[PDB]
Prior knowledge:
The longest helix of chain B is centred in the first third of the chain and has 14 residues, at 5-18. Chain B has helices at 5-18, 33-40, 46-51, 68-78, 88-94, 107-115, 123-129, 142-151, and strands spanning 28-29, 65-66, 104-106, 139-141. Chain B has eight helices and four strands. Chain C is globular. By secondary structure, chain C is mainly alpha-helical. Chain C starts with 21 loop residues before the first helix and ends in a 10-residue tail after the last helix. The chains are: A mainly alpha, B mainly alpha, C mainly alpha. The C-F interface holds C 7, 12-13, 15-19, 21-22, 25, 47, 50-54, 83, 86, 88, 91-93, 95-97, 99, 117, 122, 124, 127-128, 131-132, 135, 151-153, 155-160 and F 77, 80-81, 83-85, 87-90, 92-93, 95-97, 99-111, 114-121. Strand 1 of chain A pairs parallel with strand 1 of chain E.
Amino acid sequence: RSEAPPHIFSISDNAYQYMLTDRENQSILITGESGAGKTVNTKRVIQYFAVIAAIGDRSKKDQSPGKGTLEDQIIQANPALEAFGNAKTVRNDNSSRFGKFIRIHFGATGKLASADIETYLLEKSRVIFQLKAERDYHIFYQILSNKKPELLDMLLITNNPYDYAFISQGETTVASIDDAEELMATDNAFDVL
Amino acid sequence: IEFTPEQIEEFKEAFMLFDRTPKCEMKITYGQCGDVLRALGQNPTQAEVLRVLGKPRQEELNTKMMDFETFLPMLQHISKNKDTGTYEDFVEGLRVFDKEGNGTVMGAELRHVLATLGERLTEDEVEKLMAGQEDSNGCINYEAFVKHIMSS
Amino acid sequence: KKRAGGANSNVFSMFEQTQIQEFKEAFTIMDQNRDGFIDKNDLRDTFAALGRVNVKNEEIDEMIKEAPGPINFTVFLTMFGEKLKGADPEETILNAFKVFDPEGKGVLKADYVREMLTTQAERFSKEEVDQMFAAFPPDVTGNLDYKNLVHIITHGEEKD
Amino acid sequence: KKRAGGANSNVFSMFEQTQIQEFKEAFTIMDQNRDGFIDKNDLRDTFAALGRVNVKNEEIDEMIKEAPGPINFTVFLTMFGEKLKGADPEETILNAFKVFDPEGKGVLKADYVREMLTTQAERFSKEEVDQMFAAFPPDVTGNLDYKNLVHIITHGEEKD
Amino acid sequence: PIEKGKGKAKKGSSFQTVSALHRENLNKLMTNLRSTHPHFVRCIIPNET
Amino acid sequence: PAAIPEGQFIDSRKGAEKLLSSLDIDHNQYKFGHTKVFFKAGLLGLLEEMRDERLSRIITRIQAQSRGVLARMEYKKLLERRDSLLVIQWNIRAFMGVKNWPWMKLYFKIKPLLKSAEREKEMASMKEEFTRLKEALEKSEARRK
Amino acid sequence: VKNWPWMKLYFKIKPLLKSAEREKEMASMKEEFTRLKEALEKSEARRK
C-alpha cells in the first residue's frame, strides 16, 4: 500500500488483508446525510472484493466479466434491490427508501463464501401519494417503458401515460438516466440470479 | 578453472535436448538460459541469469540466441558462486513465525509468505505446494516441510 | 543393437489363453505355409490386397524392414511389439506435432505450417502442398495433425 | 493395384472363444505318426484314446467324404474355417425366457412352457416334449431358465 | 404463540406494531456489531442543490 | 543477516525489531501488538515493494529451490521435440505416398464381445492390484468414515 | 445334433490343455478387483 492510496478500495484492501489473517469478525460503516452517496460507496467496497480476492481470471485485458459468478451475482443483486427499494426524494434522485445490513462471508483459503443481508424499514406509506417531486419505486417506470406490446396485454399496463393514479405530481425525471433501458439491464440481472 | 570430461557431457546432453527445431540448428534462447542452468544443477536467481545475457533483454521470448560456444563461457562463469544455501539458514528463518514455541504453521499464513516478496510463486504453484491431506483448521510444520524441499 | 533400442516399444508374453485367439479366426483369408509360416515370397502376393498403395523394387526390404525372414509362432510376438515399435510409432509419430501447443489441448496452426514448409532448411515444392491442401483435416481453425496420424489406431472402424 | 482391398469382417461371435482354439493346437495328438496327414487310422487310434467306441469306419469315412480328401494341417483347418452355421450363440438362447415379459425377474412357470411347445408354433410330439422336459431344474413349478439354457449349451459333452 | 400487539413474532396481532419488531432485530445487530472491528467512512454533503 | 542468526532460534518477539530496523523503517510509523501488527499509510507500502529488490538469500532461495523442484520435474515441452522434428521431415519428404499405408483398422469389432481379454500381464498384476486396492480401502474408509 | 460327426468334442479329454483353465476362477476374482477400485475412486471425493 503506496500504490494503494485513499480511495475506498484501500480501506477494503486493508480490511481483507487484515481479516483473512486474524480471523476476527469485522465491519464497514459509512455514515452521512441525505444523498451522502452511501449506496454508490458500498458497491465500491464490494467492487474491491468482487475483483481482487476471489478466484477471478485476471491474466487477460478484457472489460472484465471474467468470472467468478458468485461475484457476478453478488453485484447484480445490488442494482436489483435498488430498482425495487430505491425511489426518489426532493434531495436525492436515488433515495434508497429502505435499509440493509450486509454480512460478507469468506472461506477457508482466501476467496469469497457468501453474504447475509437483512432489511430495516421500507417506505410503503408513499405508494398512495408522494409529496413533492419524488418518484415511486424505480421498478415501476422501468416496466412501463421497456415492456413489449405482448407483455403489455398480460401484465395489463396502460398504453397511454398519466393514467396511473398512484403516481402523484406527475412523471418526474432523473438527471442523465433513462427509465427504459435500465429495465432490460436489471431483468437480465434476474436471469443472472 | 575449466570443464572436465564428465562436466562437458553434462553440458552437451542438456544443450542438445534444448535444441527444439524440426530441422534443428543447435541454439538456445536467452529466456531458456534460466531452466538450462537449473537442470545443470546450479541454482540461480533470474538476476543471475540476466547477468550473463548478451542482450539487455529482460524475461521476454524471441530476443537473442546463444550457441554452445557462447553457452559454455556462461556456464564456466556461473560455477564460481559460493552462496547457494544450506538447511539451517532456512530453519533459523522459518522459526521467526512462532508465537508460542510450536513450530506449527497455519495454511493461509503459509501460502501468503510464498506469494508476496522475492522472485515469487503464483496462486497456482501454492495450489500445487498444498493439496492436503486431512488436517483441518489447519496446520503444517516447519521441520518436515523444509526437509521435503531439499529432498526434492 | 543398443542403438536399435530407441523409443517406441512394448513387451508381452508367450501364452494367450483366449486373447490373440483372433489369429486362428483370421488365418483362412491370408495364409501361406499352413504349418504356420509367412515367408519372403508372400509380401509380394498378399500385401497387394492389404495396402492402399504399392511396392517398388526400390523399397523392397525396406517395405519388409520389420520382418525380413522366418516369422515363426515364437517370432510373431516381435512383430506385434514392432507394431508399438515400427518406424518411430506413437512416442515420435504422434507426439511430433502434439508437442507444438504452448497451452494444452491444441491443434497445429495451419498457416504457420505452410510457412515452415517453404522456409525451414529444405524448401519443399508446390505439388505436395496441393495434394495436402485437399487432404487437410482442419477441424475448425487449425490442422488436426494428431488424428491425421492417429486414424490408424484408436478403436472405432475396421476396413483395411 | 491399390484397388483390390479386403474390407469388413466381425459380425457376431464367429469363432466362439469356447470351441475353436482347442483343436488346432490339439492337432499334434490327432496327427498320430507325425506327418500332418490324418489317415482314417490316425482317427481310429485317437478316438480309442478318447472313450469306448468311437464311430465305425464308414461313419468316419463319411466325415472324410465331407472333406476333399487328405485331412492334413491345411485342409482340416480350412474345412473347419467356413462352418459356423448350426448352433445359436449363447446369449441368443440364454435371453429366451429372460425376454419373457416387460417385467421383471421372478421365475417362469413350467405350465406355460408345456402349453406353448405343444401348441403355439411347430407342434412338438408327446415324446419330444416330455423327454426334453424331464431334465429340468424345477425350483417349485418354475424353471431355473438360465441353468436349463446351460443344459442346452455350455462347456460339456464329448466325444463328438 | 402470538400474544399480540403486532404481528406474529413479535407479537400476536394489531396488524402491525413494527416498532416492536424493530426491537428484536435491533439487539441482534448491535451487540454483535460491538464485537466486530469498526471500519468507517464519514461521508459529508457539499450542497443542498 | 547481520543481526538475527536463524536455525538455532531466537525469541518470538525480540527478533522483529531487527527485521524491521534492517531497512531503517521510521520509528513512529509502525507499532507492535500481539497478533495484529499496525502500520500507517505512506511509509509502509513502497518500503514493502523495496523488499523484493532487497530480499535475496533465504526468501528467494526457498522460492528458487521450489523453482528447481518444479523445473527438475516439469520443464517438458522442448524435450522430445528435436528427435520427433527430424522424423517429421523424414515423413514430409514423402507426403504424396503416406495415405497409402499398412496398419489401419482391421483389429477391432470383436473386442466388445470377448470375455477376459487382457489376461497374462494383468495376471502378473492381479495379486498386487487386489491387495493394495483393499489395503487402500481400509484407510480410504475408517477416517471421514 | 446330439449324434453329429464333428462338434461336441469338449471336456472328456480336451482339458489336458489350458484355455478353459483360468476362466471361472477369474469370474469370481474379477468381481473383487472392480468394486475395490470403484469405492477407491468415489470415497475420497465424498469426504472432500
